[PDB]
Amino acid sequence: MPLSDSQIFIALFIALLTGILAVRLGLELYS
Amino acid sequence: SGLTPCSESKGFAKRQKNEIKALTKRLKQYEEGSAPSLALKATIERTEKRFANYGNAGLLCGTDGLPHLISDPGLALRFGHAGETLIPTVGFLYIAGWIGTAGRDYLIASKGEAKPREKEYIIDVPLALKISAQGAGWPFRVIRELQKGTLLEKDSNITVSPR
Amino acid sequence: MAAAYLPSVLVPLVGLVFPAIAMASLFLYIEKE
Amino acid sequence: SLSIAIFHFSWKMQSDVWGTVNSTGVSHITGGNFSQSANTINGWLRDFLWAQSSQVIQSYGSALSAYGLIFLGAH
Amino acid sequence: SHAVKIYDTCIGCTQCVRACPTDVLEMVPWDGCKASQIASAPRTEDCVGCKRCESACPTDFLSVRVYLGSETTRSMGLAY
Amino acid sequence: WKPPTLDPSTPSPIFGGSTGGLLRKAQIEEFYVITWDAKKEQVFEMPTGGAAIMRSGPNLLKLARKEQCLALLTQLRNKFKTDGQIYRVFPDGEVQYLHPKDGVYPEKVNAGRTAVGAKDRSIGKNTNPVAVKFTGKLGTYDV
Amino acid sequence: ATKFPKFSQGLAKDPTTRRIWYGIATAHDFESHDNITEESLYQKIFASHFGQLAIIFLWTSGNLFHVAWQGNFPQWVQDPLHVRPIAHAIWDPHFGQPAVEAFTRGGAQGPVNIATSGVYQWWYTIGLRTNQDLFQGSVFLTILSGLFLFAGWLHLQPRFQPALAWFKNAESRLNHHLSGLFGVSSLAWTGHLVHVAIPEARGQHVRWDNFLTTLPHPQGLAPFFSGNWAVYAQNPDSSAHLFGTGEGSGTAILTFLGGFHPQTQSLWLTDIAHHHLAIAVVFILAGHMYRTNFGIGHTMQEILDAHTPPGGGLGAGHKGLFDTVNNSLHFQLGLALASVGTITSLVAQHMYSLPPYAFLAQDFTTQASLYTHHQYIAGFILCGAFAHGAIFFVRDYDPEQNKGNVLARILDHKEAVISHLSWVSLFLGFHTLGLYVHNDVMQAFGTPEKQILIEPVFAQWIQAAQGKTLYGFDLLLSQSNSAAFSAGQTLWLPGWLDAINSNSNSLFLTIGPGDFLVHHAIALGLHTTTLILVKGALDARGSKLMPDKKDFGYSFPCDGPGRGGTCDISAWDAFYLAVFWMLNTIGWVTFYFHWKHLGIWQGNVNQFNESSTYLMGWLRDYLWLNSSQLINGYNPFGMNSLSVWAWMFLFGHLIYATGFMFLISWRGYWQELIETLAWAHERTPLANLVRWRDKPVALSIVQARLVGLAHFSAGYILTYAAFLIASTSGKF
Amino acid sequence: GMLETPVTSSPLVAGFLSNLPAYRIGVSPLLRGVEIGLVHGFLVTGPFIKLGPLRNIPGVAERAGCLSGAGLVVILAVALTIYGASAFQDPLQTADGWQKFSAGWLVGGLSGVAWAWILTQT
Numbered sequence A: 001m002p003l004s005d006s007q008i009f010i011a012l013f014i015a016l017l018t019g020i021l022a023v024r025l026g027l028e029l030y031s
Numbered sequence B: 001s002g003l004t005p006c007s008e009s010k011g012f013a014k015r016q017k018n019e020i021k022a023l024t025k026r027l028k029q030y031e032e033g034s035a036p037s038l039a040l041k042a043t044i045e046r047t048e049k050r051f052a053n054y055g056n057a058g059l060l061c062g063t064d065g066l067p068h069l070i071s072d073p074g075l076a077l078r079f080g081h082a083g084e085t086l087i088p089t090v091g092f093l094y095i096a097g098w099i100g101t102a103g104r105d106y107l108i109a110s111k112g113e114a115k116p117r118e119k120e121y122i123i124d125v126p127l128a129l130k131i132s133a134q135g136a137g138w139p140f141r142v143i144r145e146l147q148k149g150t151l152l153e154k155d156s157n158i159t160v161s162p163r
Numbered sequence C: 001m002a003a004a005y006l007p008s009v010l011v012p013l014v015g016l017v018f019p020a021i022a023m024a025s026l027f028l029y030i031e032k033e
Numbered sequence D: 001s002l003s004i005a006i007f008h009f010s011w012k013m014q015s016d017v018w019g020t021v022n023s024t025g026v027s028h029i030t031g032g033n034f035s036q037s038a039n040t041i042n043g044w045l046r047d048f049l050w051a052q053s054s055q056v057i058q059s060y061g062s063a064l065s066a067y068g069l070i071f072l073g074a075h
Numbered sequence E: 001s002h003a004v005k006i007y008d009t010c011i012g013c014t015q016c017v018r019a020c021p022t023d024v025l026e027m028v029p030w031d032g033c034k035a036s037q038i039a040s041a042p043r044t045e046d047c048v049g050c051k052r053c054e055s056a057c058p059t060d061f062l063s064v065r066v067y068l069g070s071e072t073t074r075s076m077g078l079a080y
Numbered sequence F: 001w002k003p004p005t006l007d008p009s010t011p012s013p014i015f016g017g018s019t020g021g022l023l024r025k026a027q028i029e030e031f032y033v034i035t036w037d038a039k040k041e042q043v044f045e046m047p048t049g050g051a052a053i054m055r056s057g058p059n060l061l062k063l064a065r066k067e068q069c070l071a072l073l074t075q076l077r078n079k080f081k082t083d084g085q086i087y088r089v090f091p092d093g094e095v096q097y098l099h100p101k102d103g104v105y106p107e108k109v110n111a112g113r114t115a116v117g118a119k120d121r122s123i124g125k126n127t128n129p130v131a132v133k134f135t136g137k138l139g140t141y142d143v
Numbered sequence G: 001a002t003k004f005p006k007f008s009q010g011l012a013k014d015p016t017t018r019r020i021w022y023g024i025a026t027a028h029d030f031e032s033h034d035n036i037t038e039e040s041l042y043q044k045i046f047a048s049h050f051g052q053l054a055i056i057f058l059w060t061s062g063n064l065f066h067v068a069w070q071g072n073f074p075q076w077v078q079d080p081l082h083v084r085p086i087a088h089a090i091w092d093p094h095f096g097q098p099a100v101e102a103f104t105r106g107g108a109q110g111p112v113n114i115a116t117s118g119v120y121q122w123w124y125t126i127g128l129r130t131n132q133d134l135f136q137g138s139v140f141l142t143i144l145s146g147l148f149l150f151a152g153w154l155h156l157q158p159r160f161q162p163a164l165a166w167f168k169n170a171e172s173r174l175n176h177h178l179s180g181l182f183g184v185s186s187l188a189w190t191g192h193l194v195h196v197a198i199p200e201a202r203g204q205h206v207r208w209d210n211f212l213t214t215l216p217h218p219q220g221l222a223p224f225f226s227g228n229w230a231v232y233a234q235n236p237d238s239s240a241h242l243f244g245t246g247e248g249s250g251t252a253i254l255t256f257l258g259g260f261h262p263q264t265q266s267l268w269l270t271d272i273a274h275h276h277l278a279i280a281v282v283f284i285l286a287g288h289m290y291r292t293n294f295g296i297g298h299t300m301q302e303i304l305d306a307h308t309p310p311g312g313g314l315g316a317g318h319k320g321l322f323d324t325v326n327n328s329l330h331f332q333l334g335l336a337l338a339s340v341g342t343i344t345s346l347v348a349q350h351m352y353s354l355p356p357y358a359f360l361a362q363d364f365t366t367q368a369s370l371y372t373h374h375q376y377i378a379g380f381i382l383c384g385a386f387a388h389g390a391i392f393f394v395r396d397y398d399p400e401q402n403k404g405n406v407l408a409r410i411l412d413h414k415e416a417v418i419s420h421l422s423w424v425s426l427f428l429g430f431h432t433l434g435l436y437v438h439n440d441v442m443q444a445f446g447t448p449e450k451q452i453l454i455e456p457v458f459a460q461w462i463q464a465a466q467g468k469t470l471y472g473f474d475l476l477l478s479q480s481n482s483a484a485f486s487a488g489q490t491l492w493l494p495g496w497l498d499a500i501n502s503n504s505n506s507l508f509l510t511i512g513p514g515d516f517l518v519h520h521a522i523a524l525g526l527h528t529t530t531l532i533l534v535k536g537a538l539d540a541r542g543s544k545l546m547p548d549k550k551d552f553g554y555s556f557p558c559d560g561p562g563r564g565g566t567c568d569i570s571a572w573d574a575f576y577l578a579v580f581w582m583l584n585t586i587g588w589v590t591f592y593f594h595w596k597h598l599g600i601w602q603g604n605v606n607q608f609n610e611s612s613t614y615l616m617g618w619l620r621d622y623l624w625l626n627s628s629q630l631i632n633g634y635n636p637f638g639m640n641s642l643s644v645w646a647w648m649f650l651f652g653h654l655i656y657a658t659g660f661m662f663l664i665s666w667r668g669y670w671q672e673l674i675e676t677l678a679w680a681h682e683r684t685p686l687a688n689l690v691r692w693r694d695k696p697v698a699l700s701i702v703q704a705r706l707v708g709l710a711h712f713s714a715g716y717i718l719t720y721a722a723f724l725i726a727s728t729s730g731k732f
Numbered sequence H: 001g002m003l004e005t006p007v008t009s010s011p012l013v014a015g016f017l018s019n020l021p022a023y024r025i026g027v028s029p030l031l032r033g034v035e036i037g038l039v040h041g042f043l044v045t046g047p048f049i050k051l052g053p054l055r056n057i058p059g060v061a062e063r064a065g066c067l068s069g070a071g072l073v074v075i076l077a078v079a080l081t082i083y084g085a086s087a088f089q090d091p092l093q094t095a096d097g098w099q100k101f102s103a104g105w106l107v108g109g110l111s112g113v114a115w116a117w118i119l120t121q122t
């Protein structure tokens, strides 16, 4: 049974939030 | 190790037969009494003698039909394989100790001369021949020097790097 | 696969658009006085 | 440079010059595969290096076995 | 710039100063050795780091020591 | 003794030019000038490649690096027995006199020089690198 | 001048291109940064560890998501022996149409990559069945990665910044990690296996929505609390059990059957559950050893101080070693990398012979890939362990604080250690190469019966003592009346002796003289790599050629041409030299693994037995013979699915060759060439309008050694990975 | 000092170089960028049209090559823009002058790509 498009968009949004947190940690480690 | 004696191994006999067959196939293109014919016949005789000697030596053969050596001194002694590794080990160790003791004696003798570096590249050939012949009795002198403490330089007399 | 148009957008983005911006910004950063 | 020069000589003469002249024509050693595959690195590596080294790696047990030993020792 | 230090085992043989291609080293008066002079490194901003001075030093271990540090135009030997 | 001043009207050696000379670094960062007084007109080897003819009397050569000037001065002292002076010139026009710094060559010991970089110990008496951790020093040679 | 290396003022004032390279290369060496304190160093390391954990969890989430979205996991679940698992989809606009059809492989998912990581077997074994489960796991792991990123950001805040004493609390960290990070996690994995994975292996569907009402055992937790624990071992899965179905399935949850599941050719799941339960109990017990703040437990300083032999053989013993280990992060990193790399090698050696995942032993490409991957990882990690030991000796070692203990004493006889390592390396190399060359000359002269074929009787004796009856030694597990036989006969010896006396698996393969010769080659590689690394670590502080080497640091180019010449004298250079020998050693190891298993998988065991005894056999019958399909991935007649591996094969050869340039040609040639190029740019009209900000210079000596090593290693790995995957895949 | 050659020091060579838009006596840097972009962006479409992956499809070949040339022009305009922000921290050798030069390069390059497309269509 294949995934749905909404599931992929949900995963992309969660990964975008994770990327925002990654940028925050990278800035905090830099300075 | 699950091996079979080479004297009763079918692979050993098949290998001897195949090698003799290849040499005989090469043999049939030359006339009898010519130099290639004599050389190929000598090779055939050497092949037969070698396979007979390997069978008679008690060598163990694998599934490939090739002799396998036994190097554990226990299995070699209780099953007649000491001539494969153990006796060659004793012979090599004797000759290697001979060479090392002759070199050490030559170096120590050259250390006492006025130009110690001169004897290292211009060899004192009579002295080297005398010292070389005296290397037969190396284990006695070496073991005595080990017991006496004269074999080793003291650690206080050897240079080291800062730690 | 579901949303099969996504490779045709994201592969040019990750392969071309993102490295171009990344090298431009990093070049501007390492040349800053 | 000279390795590439002698490889070029060996492949080109084996492919386009050397061979057996029969009644129909000329059958070359590697059958004219230079013009088909020498324009790629993979063509060189396969059709020249991998294909033509079969003689030196199966030379054991023949008079050419010294070449196999020297091949290994030179590597 | 590279750091050049002179240790008190210097015998004042002036060989390091003669070996230097960028005029980093000189001899100053001293009293700790028989030659009554020691090497000094007042111009380490011109030191390229070639270690010709260490090759010229006869003491064991070396009396002149070059420690490669931060690189400038002069220390990298750049004419451009 | 006083430091000499650079005379920019000093004639240059007879040279046809080369590709090994000055670059943009001379105009924007620094360059170097070596002056010497030749006893006679003769051919010398340029540190940047090729043969040049030095004129009798004073000479002036502009070079990109201090090492080039000192290599030329080594050639002049060893081959032609001629002393020389080396200056550093900045793009604003400021001229810094370099060699010989006090008028005596550095290989000859001269009074009035102060030792810099001297350590009052042998090189095996340097401390361990764990002793200079989180101190800001360059190394055990810096303490 | 510039501000990119903000952690290094010396690099920021560098006017050349060296500032960019060295700024990249020294970014994670936090101890050498400007104005760094110990506390801020530990806090930065803590936050970086959080970032690495987040990267790992995001990588796992990406694997799960791409398999769930573009893979064929349900189709593989239905037919695990005849379906190639899909890694991810291919979208390449440079593809031609034959490339599109070749990578489609007659399917409907478009161009795909066939996975070699073995994630399908693992995820199937742990109970995942559908794409929904993989997608949920990927979402959960992405959330976990975000949580670890936030935790890394949070503990950099001044209120949540841990103090230096918190980082140095060794007893509390060891207690907590042993009890919870190992023991409690192992207990929870036992819970997952008992509640989910074992029921899913028996055809029962257990997920979050019904696991609270599903009994893992019919009798519940009553046998556990009553102390009658043998109930959970009763009625295991029969030999006719089909994985993932209820046919032949038992009810046991904790067994000790041993051997393999007959259908999956893998370890029993109930054995795995009992293993992790016992591991959990042992590790939870081990985490109650060290004193924290409850007045009971051991102090590691007292343990180290007490362990000095009274005869003075070890000098002061282990006195002062607590402060040496605890204050040095490089000592801890070296110990951690040594243990982790050894464990990685253990993982490689145990997953091929005792495969833990269902239908993994039948996937030959996956097994070869996993072994080669983990062995190369272990080699790199061991090299790093010795490198950080050398860094500890340069940077953190205090001779006065370690006066007379085992560290100073092993430094005090380093010449004996290095010379004995040199002797054993020389002996192994001389005699292994001599035996191989003797056998090669015997094969060349047409007389293979004159080969020196030493039987590996010691390892065969070990195999016989573990139950292999083939070699005829009758002892222990191969002796039926022995005590060791009778003790395990009712517990695990039936399955173990079934598996070890079967030649259809990888459990204790039959060995002969070729195995002897290649094992001694492996010993030579290990001993020589150790000799280079150990000599680099022990001469890191100084040698007769450079008695003040500690003053110059771990990495520096040389000491100049004086005193005879001092090229590659730093301890970093010893690491750089040892990477070559490690690559050679792991190459020998993986060559041996792949060729022996290729002969076993093709049904021709005699190919390895009759050709591995001489090196021409290795070349012709392993490299030349098995590269035929790989190099025909694309030809003048067309292409197939192996064309990507042929291209990567050539790619790795090219990268390997490019590294030789950085390793053979050295700096001063290139600096003069770049000087002429910089002249050319300034004198060229229409191009001198543009100008560089950083002055172009040649790469530094150490940087060149690093770049050449990186190209060499990348070409090595890429070439062997392409060859291994193509040669195993094209036949199986 | 500096070596002078007929290649470097001819009246004809210095005359030819002075008439180039990069060396003309008084021209605004935006206009120099415009002529340089027109000439270059006209030229780059040729290899893209005649040798691109769609070169054997009539009609699509010219469009694909001109789109590739426009993409190359955009990439080079970005490279010129980030060059000026770094190199400048002669009106051309200034930050604002190089900004105008980059804008003129982009405008001229797009114009040259469009003119090449029109010429191939006519």
Ligand SMILES: CC1=C(/C=C/C(C)=C/C=C/C(C)=C/C=C/C=C(C)/C=C/C=C(C)/C=C/C2=C(C)CCCC2(C)C)C(C)(C)CCC1
Binding pocket: G330, G331, G332, G334, G335, G338, G339, G342, G385, G386, G388, G389, G390, G392, G393, G534, G537
């Ligand atoms: C330099 C240095 C360092 C480093 C080092 C290293 C890196 C090492 C490694 C090491 C290693 C890598 C090791 C390993 C080892 C192992 C072992 C030692 C093992 C053992 C084992 C055993 C004991 C077992 C037994 C058994 C059993 C139990 C069962 C049956 C079988 C057998 C018998 C096998 C450090 C940091 C410390 C410090 C500084 C200096």
Ligand code: SF4
Binding pocket: E004, E019, E020, E021, E022, E023, E024, E025, E046, E047, E048, E049, E050, E051, E052, E053, E054, E066
């Ligand atoms: S390293 Fe070279 S430049 Fe520096 S002081 Fe020594 S000789 Fe002079």
Ligand code: SF4
Binding pocket: E006, E009, E010, E011, E012, E013, E014, E015, E016, E017, E038, E039, E053, E056, E057, E058, E059, E063, E064
């Ligand atoms: S070469 Fe050495 S000993 Fe001589 S003056 Fe210089 S530093 Fe002193």
